[PDB]
């Protein structure tokens, strides 16, 4: 077999997304970039046969439409899959979308129109996305004309989805009906495009709820209204394009191509051009956004606590164990064999993907240490670090007025969408014996502590 990393180095974590964590990698020869994305055999079932993936893999490398990752290898070891493909650097569309002044149906209409695009040809090569949603739209670079990369198409077909909330967030607004009781074919991704289509123009939902549980009943029972006072902004033919993506019996659901060939898209996309700009739309947008990446990050933070809590105790007890004599210390090669023996047992972390990078991280801790518990600490420090920051650049971000306060009701909804119990989460804030209705930052972080056991 090959081995990825005979070809490969990592060079830093480009994030999480579905099914595993993603990093950016270089070939060792030719010094071609590339986005990786690292599968882990024990955190993720496999629906399908090997036969059938390598089939799937097969076809997916020869693929090639401007809206739609390149994919370039694929390689399997023991422990995980590896995934090898195009690296895009324009980050998330609606990251995008909320960094602007004017935002009209008309750069809704190229936004969708590329979508589509991919979409069509996905499904003419058989192939299914199913979870297709803001997340997996990238921008392809920093530029003002970046073409539209759709990540992640046939994966689900693959393997199976987290049940953690950590992984599932945000994931209920786009999911077709059909998917949730089990006959689907290709018309789910044309739902969820209708879905992200009615996201751009009015700022929220079309199925929305206070939790996870009330948003599938709402896309299960599949009624939605354009009776927000933003749609009154919205051009007819928009709200029939919805209409005919968001229908739902899927043979009776507009197909990716003839969607293409709607007459809001054939309008809006002219060249020619013949508007305002939706400033609710985009003010919501922002809002949603915010909402969505500060309980993503609340859940991360949590899950990395308890991680490091698992991987703190477990590594003090194999130095314990390598403290051949008994004194509480150990030198550069132990250090390092102990950390590997660490990720045998919890399974490689991302950045660590050889021999040569645990040594670089443990070269890193000595930096700082210039006594095997002094170095358990800086280790675990190190590995919560992006998460705690994370945590307080998404606080940040949430808090548009910059009060360095988050209100009892925006603690509700955060908290609906992470999907932490209403009663749970107001009792661990009464434990805030004062009530202002209202927590700074570091009243919130104690807040997420408590509900992961510390
Ligand atoms: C940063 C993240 C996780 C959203 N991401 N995912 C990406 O999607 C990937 C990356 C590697 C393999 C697969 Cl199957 C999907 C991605 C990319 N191609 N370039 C830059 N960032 C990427």
Redesign the pocket.
């Known amino acids: 077999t090959a081995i990825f990393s005979d070809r490969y180095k990592g060079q830093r974590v480009?994030?999480?997304?579905s099914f595993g964590?993603?990093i950016?990698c270089k070939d060792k020869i030719t010094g071609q970039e590339?986005?990786?994305?690292v599968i882990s055999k024990r955190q993720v079932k496999q629906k399908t046969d090997k036969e059938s993936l390598l089939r799937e893999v097969q076809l997916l490398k020869q693929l090639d439409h401007p809206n739609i990752?390149k994919?370039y290898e694929f390689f399997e070891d023991k422990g995980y899959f590896y995934?090898?493909?195009?690296?895009?650097?324009g980050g998330?569309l609606f990251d995008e979308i909320i960094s602007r002044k004017r935002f009209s149906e008309v750069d809704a209409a190229r936004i969708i129109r590329q979508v589509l695009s991919g979409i069509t040809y996905m499904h003419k090569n058989k192939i299914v996305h199913r979870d297709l949603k803001p997340?997996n739209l990238?921008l392809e670079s920093k530029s003002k004309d970046a073409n539209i990369?759709i990540?992640?198409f046939g994966?689900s077909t693959h393997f199976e989805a987290s049940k953690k909330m950590k992984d599932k967030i945000g994931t209920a607004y786009y999911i077709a009906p059909e998917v949730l009781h089990g006959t689907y074919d290709e018309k789910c991704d044309v739902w969820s495009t209708g879905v992200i289509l009615y996201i751009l123009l009015s700022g929220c939902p079309p199925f929305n709820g206070a939790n996870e549980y009330d948003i599938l009943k709402k896309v299960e029972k599949g009624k939605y209204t354009f009776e927000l006072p933003q749609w009154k902004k919205v051009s007819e033919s928009a709200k029939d394009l919805i209409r005919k993506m968001l229908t739902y019996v899927p043979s009776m659901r507009i197909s990716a191509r003839d969607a293409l060939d709607h007459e809001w898209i054939q309008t809006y996309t002219k060249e020619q051009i013949s508007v305002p700009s939706l400033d609710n739309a985009i003010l919501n947008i922002r809002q949603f956004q915010g909402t969505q990446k500060l309980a993503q990050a609340a859940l991360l933070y949590m899950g990395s606590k308890l991680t490091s809590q698992d991987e703190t105790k477990e590594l003090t007890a194999i130095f314990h164990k390598m403290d051949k004599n008994g004194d509480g210390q150990l030198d550069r090669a132990e250090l390092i064999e102990g950390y590997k023996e660490l990720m045998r047992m919890k399974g490689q972390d991302a950045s660590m993907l050889d021999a040569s990078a645990v040594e670089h991280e443990v070269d890193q801790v000595l930096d700082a240490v210039d006594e095997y518990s002094e170095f358990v600490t800086v280790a675990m420090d190190r590995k919560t670090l992006l998460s705690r920051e994370r945590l307080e650049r998404a606080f940040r971000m949430f808090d548009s007025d910059n009060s360095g306060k988050i209100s009892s009701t925006e603690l509700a909804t955060i908290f609906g969408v992470s999907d932490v119990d209403s009663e749970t989460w107001k009792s661990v804030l009464s434990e805030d014996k004062n009530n202002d209705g209202e927590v700074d930052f570091d009243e919130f972080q104690q807040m997420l502590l408590k509900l992961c056991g510390n």
């Open positions: 480009l994030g999480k997304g964590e993603v950016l590339c986005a990786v994305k990752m994919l995934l090898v493909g195009e690296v895009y650097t998330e997340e990238l990369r990540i992640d994966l």
